[PDB]
Structure 1
Amino acid sequence: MVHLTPVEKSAVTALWGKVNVDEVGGEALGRLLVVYPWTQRFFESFGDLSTPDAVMGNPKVKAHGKKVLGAFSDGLAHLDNLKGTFATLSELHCDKLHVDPENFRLLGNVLVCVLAHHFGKEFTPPVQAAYQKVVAGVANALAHKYH
């Protein structure tokens, strides 16, 4: 949602094919942790998280990073329903984890800030708009069983 036009649907996968599904996940989450330091309370099991380079360097963040993109690519596959695709994940994050749904929005913004960091001017405003629709729908899906 809102919908993603066919051009938006075609511009997004194109870019998403150039992104290293094994390293950029920990890149997004890592900055969520450093940009928004309070989110570090959710990942206390991950050892050292006291400094920027440490958080970026912490291996578990990296490894957990991949699972994130996992879910996001997974959600890219079916814009049909992020709500259903993230039913399991919503319940995990919402009921069992107590993560405030605003942090969902933030990750989807850090992610978008991260895509922009890699791809420079290939990350055009219309490509950004399309991705904003994706990180919105995904953050909304995850926060569905708070509804």
Structure 2
Amino acid sequence: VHLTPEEKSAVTALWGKVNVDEVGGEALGRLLVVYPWTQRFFESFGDLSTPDAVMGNPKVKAHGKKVLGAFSDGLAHLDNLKGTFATLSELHCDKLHVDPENFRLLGNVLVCVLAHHFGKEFTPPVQAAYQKVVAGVANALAHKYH
């Protein structure tokens, strides 16, 4: 995407305070809880019956870690998201069959997690910066769909 020097720095500064694995398990768990239909891809993960089951599920957490680790690596390439996520875009389309709408949902849940995690530090301008980033990544992941 195109971020002002100021937004890139706001994004980077907050990301340095993030426990990637913790936040990853949390965003993925919340996605499954808030938009239950996204559970359709995780039937092999076991028990997803209640919110507590989802949040405590080891496989959800493991998946959360993987997804957010990729996201994190992505932050080093804000100037080339499309190029960075090309291969993952194709995999998500051709083999995983994930409706890209799910990327948009995860991005909005990630924003809510960051807000919850950081409180007042997650100011309106910082939010705006992150919103462009989550939209950019969702766009990059959906790019190769056909």
Contact 2:21–2:69 (CA<8 Å) still a contact in 1? no
Range moving further from structure 2, 122-131 or 15-24 = 15-24
Output the aligned Cα RMSD.
1.0
| 1:9-30 Cα shifts (integer Å, max 9, x gaps) | 0011111111101211010011
- Scaled by the length of structure 2, the TM-score of the pair is 0.96
Deviation at 1:57, TM superposition (A): 0.3
Residue-pair matches, total: 146
**1:44, 1:84 → 2: CA distance?**
31
Deviation at 1:64, TM superposition (A): 1.1
**2:111, 2:65 → 1: CA distance?**
16
**2:56, 2:127 → 1: CA distance?**
28
Runs of at least 5 residues in structure 2 that lack an aligned partner in the other structure: none
Percent sequence identity over matched residues?
99
Q: Match for residue 45 of structure 1?
A: 44
Deviation at 1:111, TM superposition (A): 0.4
Deviation at 1:4, TM superposition (A): 1.1
Segments of 4+ moved more than 3 angstroms:
none
Q: Match for residue 74 of structure 1?
A: 73
Runs of at least 5 residues in structure 1 that lack an aligned partner in the other structure: none
Contact 2:25–2:61 (CA<8 Å) still a contact in 1? yes
Range moving further from structure 2, 134-143 or 97-106 = 97-106
- Scaled by the length of structure 1, the TM-score of the pair is 0.96
| 1:50-82 Cα shifts (integer Å, max 9, x gaps) | 110110000111111111111111110001211
**1:67, 1:74 → 2: CA distance?**
11
